[PDB]
Design a protein around this ligand. Structure first.
Ligand SMILES: *[C@@H]1O[C@H](CO)[C@@H](O)[C@H](O)[C@H]1NC(C)=O
Ligand SMILES: *[C@@H]1O[C@H](CO)[C@@H](O)[C@H](O)[C@H]1NC(C)=O
Ligand SMILES: *[C@@H]1O[C@H](CO)[C@@H](O)[C@H](O)[C@H]1NC(C)=O
Ligand SMILES: *[C@@H]1O[C@H](CO)[C@@H](O)[C@H](O)[C@H]1NC(C)=O
Ligand SMILES: [Zn+2]
Lengths: 596, 195, 211, 219
């Protein structure tokens, strides 16, 4: 019997027990999340321990089938996924040291607090007091004080732990036939063994840089507009040519500029569309909202929710004594079990989050027929894009006019469209150079081109000449401000937020071509179009059984990440910004600093 | 003038596993096929060779009732010319099969909280079964070139695996009771008429 | 292989009683057992299959039960046509094995046999071979013992016996025994005796003749 | 009207071969498994060979393995057995058996045997056809008889006084001698008063040799 036959039999057995073990673990997790109790915590921990033990034993068993003897792709992919050694390549003491370091940094981030001067008892964490300060307050002194306090009382603590984390992660990385840990993160997009769909680990850098070069002009114009508005808001603290202070950007890290909308609204006398009052007037509840979402998904030809969905899902907060997490989540428990966990209110935002979660559920239902190891999105940037295109389609005024939430006498004007587009751009475009910077800096740090004694010297360098930001207070090498962010101290990849942002705009546009939409792309609604639903379902049903390039081509027609759809989406706002910025400067000064 | 007992096949408190499906004989009866087909309580009712639409005026030598339980997605596998684990290793029907297949949901009776693992199916076999073949062997399966020595280690598996039935599973994972009726016509008694 | 054992090898019963037959196996065969009848000079035909299922046309008094390694069959009523020999067969795996067989006979009061002896005629002696005949008539039951003595010497390997079927009128048995010797050996001795041991006789009966 | 008829029986010398056939009527032959059973003279039933409905698997007993071959021709609705290297232990009556149920009939394509044939007698011996020898057994109530010896093959019919004497007449089954020939004794019990007055004559008829011998019993 050939090696491929033993591999097939082994995978059949593995799937057989894996389905049941995963279902038990998922059910325990659901029962804990919807009903928090120490007994539920123990059950979840036991199920997770059993599942992890089974996975480790199956990985050890699968390491006895050499890859070269398997020629069938759907078998080799499963063997590759089950044959990853991971971090078990070094000694046990080093693994224990790594676990202790990670737990200590997580505990420091979660419990790290700042005590206000002269009041040793009134100490506030990042959430929600410092969160309120960053999201609402615009006072210069208070924001600068909170910025400095968080970056001094936390980053200095986590600097040496981050150094040891880098050392241990790099060791575990190059012990696994890898160059470094950044290569370990980048290996997710690698595709080998398929003709016409190859993708090397080195093409990702070129693709990201090529996309960023084309993204740059829109970022420049938005930056100029925000800088002019900030000059109007901060007269003596911002220079016509200089950069922007990092403590007045609406957040703590410069990642999102949404909170600057009140300072950058084009037309502040025309309010945005809100249908909450109409919902309250028409007596809507959570059941009505979810039925409307189901009707929307039926209109495009997608199957409706099962009876178990309506009997088992949690669509409202139980209140009373029963406590449950209110984070919106979509659960695929296995064995044909699909549920939504959401504390839905009678509100537009929840009306869109319901569509997001239901899109996640539809995607989960699509690939239920695939093998166990192939029940996932094509890559890390597909699932969120599929989730967010549904909210994009649902948020249009026509959709609310077709369900009675908008009075038939409501006529749209261009000012509200411009306001909506600027609100979208403050969130979408702004985070994108920041993500590129963070990924580049971590790649170089793991690679070794940035000596430790220069870390911050490099960290505040690129801010000036890519993100266009200068620091308000100089920092020495005792600071480790990047590790103060969740995505650095908790060992998470951060480039997926870049690619995903592009992917959705490649999806929606294509769907809007199937719906024969006329007009601006931001006014597109895909309801009552079976062609769009079929085109989406074709990609949704694949799962991980195919390379992500082929799955992307199934919807978009191109096998590479593309950025033109984003520019096409934001074209009217780009034109408005170009008209507004005729009497200003494009660019930044990398030497100016508010602290002189 | 005695009516056929179908309370012993349909109204049975306990059903059999798919690899050990149970079989019983019915004879000397006044069996009427219109009652079952017009009960409006069965999910699947498909007859091959003969039509159920008021064809209750036929005589046969013997009636074989074969009962077992499977999951929902496998209900379509109980048919002529079907392929799968159940069709190849547990239950088989001839290509020229003439007879009826009835299937009804049993989630309210054959599903338990925490998993009911009393139903088993054969997962590995050296070859496919013949029609109406029943195998109850427990010999371990040698997936490699080395002898297994009667122990389940590496490339040595138990050929029987148990279903997991829970009330919260989907309709494709819920239990389903299946009864196959087969008719025999010999050249003498023709005792199963059912006028 | 699997060996199927049937003990006892014979049975006697009277009309109106209840009859039970037992079959045993050496391994586990689940419910793959069959029961067969057979009258002399006729095809067997099947009575019970699957160890518990009756056949079409058989009278509804036979009942089979049992699973695993031991099985039983019950008659529950005796009829004039219910007198035959019964067999059990396993159908689990090859080779399929039958049983020894059990025979149902008629119960009757013990009756002693009548014993006769016949020395060889001179016509047979002219050919060079001497045959001596010992006859038992109208006895019961079938079990009996016959011995040959030549000058107080036991004869072994030179005698053959035959038994007949039950008579319809009174249910009797009859037995014949033949002893064959050469002419030279026959002329070498004088006294030849046939000894009969039976349940109908309190002591063995010996009939002897002198040459 | 389900029927099975067997053919091919006869007398064969040791070391030769023979071929038996059974033909069926009253059912679809192509969906049933078939068996061979053999019963030695005076002993119980013995299972010989089995073939499945489609002829994929054929199985044989240990005592006939390597010499006997089973086959089926369901295009002609018949079943065949071939016997090679025949010996004296193969003399028996053969039944061709049809099992109950279609295809595997509930397990491993083995089930109970529902229909049987009438069987054919197969005899393996070296001895040829020889005429019977009749000897008297005179009484010494009284009993007398006639001994038939050295005849082959079966059967031989014995009558008393041309059928006029039937009461008390006992005919015993034949027995096989070490020389390869058969012998039996047919006897009758008469009152001692009839001795000397009534004449008793036994008639022995052997159809294969077409030989009729009349022997009178004298005191
Ligand atoms: C939540 O858990 C508690 C204790 O484990 C239990 O008493 C309660 O019934 C649970 N709630 C639900 C809705 O099952
Ligand atoms: C790979 O194996 C699957 C079953 O696991 C099979 O369906 C598929 O056809 C195989 N690939 C090829 C190219 O045959
Ligand atoms: C979903 O739609 C189907 C129609 O194809 C209908 O039969 C079923 O009842 C619907 N389910 C729900 C929960 O509305
Ligand atoms: C089975 O039991 C139900 C319950 O009363 C009865 O209605 C039905 O007639 C019985 N027989 C069948 C064949 O369903
Ligand atoms: Zn999401």
């Amino acid at each position: 019997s050939t090696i491929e036959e033993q591999a097939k039999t082994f995978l059949d057995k593995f799937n057989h027990e894996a389905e049941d073990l995963f279902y038990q673990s998922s059910l325990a997790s659901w029962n804990y999340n919807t009903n928090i109790t120490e007994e539920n915590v123990q059950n979840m921990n036991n199920a997770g321990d059993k599942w992890s033990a089974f996975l480790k034993e199956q990985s050890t068993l699968a390491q006895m089938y050499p890859l070269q003897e398997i020629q069938n792709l759907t078998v080799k992919l499963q063997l590759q996924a089950l044959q990853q050694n991971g971090s078990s390549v070094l000694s046990e003491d080093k693994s224990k040291r790594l676990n202790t370091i990670l737990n200590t940094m997580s505990t420091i981030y979660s419990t790290g607090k700042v005590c206000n001067p002269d009041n040793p008892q009134e100490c506030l964490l990042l959430e929600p007091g410092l969160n309120e300060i960053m999201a609402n307050s615009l006072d210069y002194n208070e924001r600068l004080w909170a910025w400095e306090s968080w970056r001094s009382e936390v980053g200095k603590q986590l600097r040496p732990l981050y150094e040891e984390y880098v050392v241990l992660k790099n060791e575990m990385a190059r012990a696994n036939h890898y160059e470094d840990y950044g290569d370990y993160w980048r290996g997710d997009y690698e595709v080998n063994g398929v003709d016409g769909y190859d993708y090397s680990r080195g093409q990702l850098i070129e693709d990201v840089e090529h996309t960023f070069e084309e993204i740059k002009p829109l970022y420049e114009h938005l930056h100029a507009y925000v800088r002019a508005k900030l000059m109007n808001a901060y007269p003596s603290y911002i220079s016509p040519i200089g950069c922007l202070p990092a403590h007045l950007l609406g957040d703590m890290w410069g990642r999102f500029w949404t909170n600057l909308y009140s300072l950058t609204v084009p037309f502040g006398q025309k309010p945005n569309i809100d249908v909450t009052d109409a919902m309250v007037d028409q007596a809507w509840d959570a059941q009505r909202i979810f039925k409307e979402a189901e009707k929307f998904f039926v209109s495009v030809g997608l199957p409706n929710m099962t009876q178990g969905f309506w009997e088992n899902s949690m669509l409202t907060d139980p209140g009373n004594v029963q406590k449950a997490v209110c984070h919106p989540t979509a659960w695929d428990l296995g064995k044909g079990d699909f549920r939504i966990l959401m504390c839905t209110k009678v509100t537009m935002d929840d009306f869109l989050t319901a569509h997001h979660e239901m899109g996640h559920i539809q995607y989960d239902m699509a690939y239920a027929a695939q093998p166990f190891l192939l029940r996932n999105g094509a890559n890390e940037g597909f699932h969120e894009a599929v989730g967010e295109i549904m909210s994009l389609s649902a948020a249009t005024p026509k959709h609310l006019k077709s369900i009675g939430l908008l009075s038939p006498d409501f006529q749209e004007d261009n000012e509200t469209e411009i306001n909506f587009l600027l609100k979208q751009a403050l969130t979408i475009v702004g985070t994108l150079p920041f993500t590129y910077m963070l990924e580049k800096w971590r790649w170089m740090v793991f690679k070794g081109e940035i000596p430790k004694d220069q870390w911050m010297k490099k960290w505040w360098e690129m801010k000036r000449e890519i993100v266009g930001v200068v620091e308000p207070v100089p920092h020495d090498e005792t600071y480790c401000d990047p590790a103060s962010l969740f995505h650095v101290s908790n060992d998470y990849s951060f480039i997926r937020y870049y690619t995903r942002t592009l992917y959705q705009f490649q999806f929606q546009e294509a769907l809007c071509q199937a719906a024969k939409h006329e007009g601006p792309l931001h006014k597109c609604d895909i309801s009552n179009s079976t062609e769009a639903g079929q085109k989406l379902f074709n990609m949704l049903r694949l799962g991980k059984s195919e390379p992500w390039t082929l799955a992307l081509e199934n919807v978009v027609g191109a096998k590479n990440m593309n950025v033109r759809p984003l520019l096409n989406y934001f074209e009217p706002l780009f034109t408005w910004l170009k008209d507004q910025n005729k009497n200003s400067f494009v660019g930044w000064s990398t030497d100016w600093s508010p602290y002189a | 003038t005695n009516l056929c007992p179908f309370g012993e096949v349909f109204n049975a408190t306990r059903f059999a596993s798919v690899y050990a499906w149970n079989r019983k004989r019915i004879s000397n009866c006044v069996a009427d096929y219109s009652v079952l087909y017009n009960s409006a309580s069965f999910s699947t009712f498909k007859c091959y060779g003969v039509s159920p639409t008021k064809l209750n005026d036929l005589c046969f030598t013997n009636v074989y009732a074969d009962s077992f339980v499977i999951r929902g997605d496998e209900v379509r596998q109980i048919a002529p010319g079907q392929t799968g684990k159940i069709a190849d290793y547990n239950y088989k029907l001839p290509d020229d099969f003439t007879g009826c297949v009835i299937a009804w949901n049993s989630n309210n009776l054959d599903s338990k909280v925490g998993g009911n693992y009393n139903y088993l199916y054969r997962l590995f076999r050296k070859s496919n079964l013949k029609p109406f073949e029943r195998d109850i062997s427990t010999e371990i399966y040698q997936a490699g070139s080395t002898p297994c020595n009667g122990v389940e280690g590496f490339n040595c598996y138990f050929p029987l695996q148990s279903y997991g039935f829970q009330p919260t599973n989907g309709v494709g994972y819920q239990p389903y009771r299946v009864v196959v009726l087969s008719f025999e016509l010999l050249h003498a008694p023709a005792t199963v008429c059912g006028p | 292989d699997i060996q199927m054992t049937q003990s006892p090898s014979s049975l006697s019963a009277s009309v109106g009683d209840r009859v039970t037959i037992t079959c045993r196996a050496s391994q586990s065969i689940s419910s793959y057992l069959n029961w067969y009848q057979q009258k002399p000079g006729k095809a067997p035909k099947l009575l019970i299959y699957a160890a518990s299922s009756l056949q079409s046309g058989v009278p509804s008094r036979f009942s089979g039960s049992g699973s695993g390694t031991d099985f039983t069959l019950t008659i529950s009523s005796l009829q004039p046509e219910d007198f035959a020999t019964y067999y059990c067969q396993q159908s689990y795996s090859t080779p399929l094995t039958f049983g020894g067989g059990i025979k149902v006979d008629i119960k009757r009061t013990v009756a002693a046999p009548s014993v006769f002896i016949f020395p060889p005629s001179d016509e047979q002696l002219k050919s060079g071979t001497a045959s001596v005949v010992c006859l038992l008539n109208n006895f019961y039951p079938r079990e009996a013992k016959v011995q040959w003595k030549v000058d107080n010497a036991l004869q072994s390997g030179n005698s053959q016996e035959s038994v007949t079927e039950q008579d319809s009128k009174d249910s009797t048995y009859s037995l014949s025994s033949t002893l064959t010797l050469s002419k030279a050996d026959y002329e070498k001795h004088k006294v030849y005796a046939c000894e009969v041991t039976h349940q109908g006789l309190s002591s063995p009966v010996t009939k002897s003749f002198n040459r | 009207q389900v029927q099975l008829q067997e053919s091919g029986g006869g007398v064969v010398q040791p070391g030769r071969s023979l071929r038996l056939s059974c033909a069926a009527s009253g059912f679809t032959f192509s969906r049933y498994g078939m068996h061979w059973v053999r019963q030695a003279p005076g002993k119980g039933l013995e299972w010989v060979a089995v073939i499945w409905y489609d002829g994929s698997n054929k199985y044989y007993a240990d005592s006939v393995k390597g010499r006997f071959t089973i086959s089926r021709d369901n295009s002609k609705n018949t079943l065949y057995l071939q016997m090679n290297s025949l010996r004296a232990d193969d003399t028996a009556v053969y039944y061709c058996a049809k099992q109950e149920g279609t295809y595997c009939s509930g397990g491993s394509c083995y089930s109970g045997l529902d229909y049987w044939g009438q069987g054919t007698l197969v005899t393996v011996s070296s001895a040829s056809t020889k005429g019977p020898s009749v000897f008297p057994l005179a009484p010494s109530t009284a009993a007398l008889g006639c001994l038939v010896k050295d005849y082959f093959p079966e059967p031989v019919t014995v009558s008393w006084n041309s059928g006029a004497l039937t009461s008390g007449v006992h005919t015993f089954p034949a027995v096989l001698q070490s020389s390869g020939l058969y012998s039996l004794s047919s006897v009758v019990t008469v009152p001692s008063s009839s001795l000397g007055t009534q004449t008793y004559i036994c008639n022995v008829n052997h159809k294969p040799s077409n030989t009729k011998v009349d022997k009178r019993v004298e005191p």
